[PDB]
Curated annotation (Swiss-Prot), chains A, B:
Quaternary structure, from the entry: Homodimer.
Keywords tagged on the record: Cytoplasm, Heme, Iron, Metal-binding, Oxygen transport, Transport
Chief site of localization: cytoplasm
InterPro entries xrefs: Globin, Globin-like_OT, Globin-like_sf, Globin/Proto, Mb-like_M
Name under which the protein is recorded: Globin-1
PROSITE patterns attached to this UniProt entry: GLOBIN
GO cellular component: cytoplasm
CDD domains: Mb-like (cd01040)
Molecular function GO labels: heme binding; identical protein binding; metal ion binding; oxygen binding; oxygen carrier activity
Taxonomic placement: Eukaryota, Metazoa, Spiralia, Lophotrochozoa, Mollusca
Pfam family, one: Globin
Globin domain residues: 8-145
Family: Belongs to the globin family.
Superkingdom of the organism of origin: Eukaryota
Length: 145, 145
């Protein structure tokens, strides 16, 4: 269950998540747009799902993409702040899961975000250990998809 | 015009928003649910829009309502964090505006949140001065609906 996935996040994993978020989460506009643009560059097949945002190749200049990207970073902020209470983490994860279930986004497709996250982390010198920690958090969401 | 509305957030207003947010934003789960339950109690006619959340009278016990409520508080956190840059404030406001336009929520009905905000603020010893400051921020979202 989603609870099982959340309940399994260990102290060391939460530590790595918080330490890396202190940095990547400090510039939500910049890193949020970077995450989205990287997803579009490496997984062009996903561009079609974001038609509401218009021309995503416009990057930072695209106000709709900018607003969406900042919002995405606050969903992550939410997750990070709820790490110590699985009950709360689960209810927020299920909420955002619905936002994607309605768009027909499968657990496998949601996992495509791992590549971009790994790259953004690396740009700030956070290695594989950190990317693995984030993959575990993403897996919590996948448990609800 | 959302841009003219955003221009109404003067130095004094921004200060009052930040000062009060430091207090109300410290307990997103508690105050978020308080905001929603107050809305449903004072404006019963809005409950119909929240069909997906199930029995909202259950309050904190309702997992869907708690998840929704926490999310709402992070939307407000987002707004507060963008007060420095009007261009970014507008793009995030328009993003959440879409979320409500799709639910057929008008500017007038969105404004029904002012009562709840004033009540929650009052319970924390923040009077009309602060309630009026928040009404100006809510007005920016209303201009986009
Ligand atoms: C770290 C992972 C991710 C997070 C935290 C996240 C968060 C969000 C948030 C907060 C929204 C806005 C929900 C709404 O207002 O309706 C959203 C929308 C959306 N997400 Fe994600 N998302 C993630 C990964 C993905 C991935 C990998 C895909 C695609 C393969 C995806 C596809 C979508 C789509 C299509 C929308 C709708 C955009 C629109 O039309 O406005 N998301 N996401
Ligand atoms: C401070 C004011 C408010 C903020 C910041 C706010 C924020 C939000 C957020 C972030 C969502 C989730 C969007 C999504 O995932 O689709 C949401 C959903 C919603 N909001 Fe608001 N909202 C506010 C006031 C209101 C008011 C006053 C009404 C109704 C009179 C309203 C009606 C709705 C409805 C119907 C939903 C959909 C809930 C669901 O089915 O999940 N909102 N709101």
């Amino acid at each position: 269950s989603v609870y099982d996935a959340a309940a399994q996040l260990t102290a060391d994993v939460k530590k790595d998540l918080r330490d890396s978020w202190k940095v990547i989460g400090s510039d939500k506009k910049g890193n949020g747009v970077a995450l989205m643009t990287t997803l579009f560059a490496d997984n062009q097949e996903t561009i079609g799902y974001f038609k509401r945002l218009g021309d995503v190749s416009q990057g930072m200049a695209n106000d709709k993409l900018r607003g969406h990207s900042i919002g995405l970073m606050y969903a992550l902020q939410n997750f990070i702040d709820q790490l110590d209470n699985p009950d709360d983490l689960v209810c927020v994860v299920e909420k955002f899961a619905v936002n994607h279930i309605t768009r027909k986004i499968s657990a496998a497709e949601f996992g495509k975000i791992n590549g971009p996250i790994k790259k953004v982390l690396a740009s700030k010198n956070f290695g594989d250990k950190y990317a693995n920690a984030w993959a575990k958090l993403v897996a919590v969401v996948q448990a609800a998809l």
